[PDB]
């Protein structure tokens, strides 16, 4: 549909339109030469912050081994202590908004297990 259009749809339907949320993350006068500081530095600082926030997400995908892919399958088993829900009630009943509130308590443990799995796998095959 558009930008953030699948926010209310299910997780199975919002995963097919990931390309519309990843593309929108990068887009006579000498009397008042000091006046161009307003909206000349505020606009410039907003463009640098959008680049650094984009490079931090692309760096974590490179560490986990998912560089350049939007849907990446990893090699870490899903622990049942995080969410004891069936697969049919996640992609067909829940949305991405309320799913973040259930994993934000454990969102740093999963980010460490994905890092520990790639450097382990890179060590075997070299």
């Amino acid at each position: 549909l558009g930008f953030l259009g699948a926010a209310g749809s299910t997780m199975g339907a919002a995963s097919m339109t990931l390309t519309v949320q990843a593309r929108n993350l990068l887009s006579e006068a000498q009397q008042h030469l000091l006046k161009l500081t307003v909206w000349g530095i505020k606009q410039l600082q907003a463009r640098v912050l959008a680049v650094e926030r984009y490079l931090r997400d692309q760096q974590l995908l490179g560490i986990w081994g998912c560089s350049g892919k939007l849907i990446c399958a990893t090699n870490v088993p899903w622990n049942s202590s995080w969410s004891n829900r069936n697969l049919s009630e996640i992609w067909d009943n829940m949305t991405w908004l309320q799913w973040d509130k259930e994993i934000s308590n454990y969102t740093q443990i999963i980010y460490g297990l994905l890092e520990e799995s790639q450097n382990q796998q890179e060590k075997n095959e070299q």
Binding site: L4, A6, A22, L61, I71, V76
Partner: peptide
């Protein structure tokens, strides 16, 4: 068994 997958571009805001 279930496996964790990484999705980039989910409609989540804060």
């Amino acid at each position: 068994n279930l496996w964790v997958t990484v999705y980039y571009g989910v409609p989540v805001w804060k």
